[PDB]
Amino acid sequence: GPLGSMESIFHEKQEGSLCAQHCLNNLLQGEYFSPVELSSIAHQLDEEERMRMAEGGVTSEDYRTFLQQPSGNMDDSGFFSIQVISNALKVWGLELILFNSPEYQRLRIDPINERSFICNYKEHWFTVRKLGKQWFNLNSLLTGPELISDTYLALFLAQLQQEGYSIFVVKGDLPDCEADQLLQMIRVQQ
């Protein structure tokens, strides 16, 4: 044991702090992404998600299901669409979908049941990553790694859910980062 994970909780090498792309880089355990791509990814997502859903028929439901997400396409004042992460996630291997979805939750979808959750507040949104065995908020409003209890993460999402609705469930393959090491895997290994 490292004795204290918080000792160095965060993303190793970070070269892109401005938009959520930062949290994404940390979440992905490694940047390797630019802001320009986010804009293009978001745009491509709209065109892709629009055509993909439109073409596939989106069974309409898929439309109303996703539509739940925040529109506005995206900004350029220092923020990117959360959907951009989804596009990168999908292309990364994993996928990102809205959690609010009462259909999934009812079917049996828990907030903690996941590994990576995303929250959106009005405009600005944050990225939640499950570090070790607990959820940790990452963005900037937390002024750092805000440890969120399993009973809190769900309670929190519930609060935001009841307050409005802006949560995205990250499903798929999630890479490990420094936090993953703090969980157990110590540097010593060679």
Active-site positions read 19, 124, 139
Q: Which residue has the tokens 């959690």?
A: 99
Q: Which of 113, 103, 17, 5 is nearest to 61 (CA)?
A: 103
**φ, ψ (nearest 5 deg) of residue 41:** -60, -45
What does the block give as tokens for 48?
A: 């892709």
d(Cα 107, Cα 27) in Å, to the nearest integer?
27
Q: 161 near 167, Cβ under 8 Å?
A: yes
What does the block give as tokens for 115?
A: 């590994």
d(Cα 19, Cα 122) in Å, to the nearest integer?
15
d(Cα 5, Cα 15) in Å, to the nearest integer?
22
Distances, alpha carbon 94 to alpha carbons 16, 56, 61, in Å: 21, 20, 22
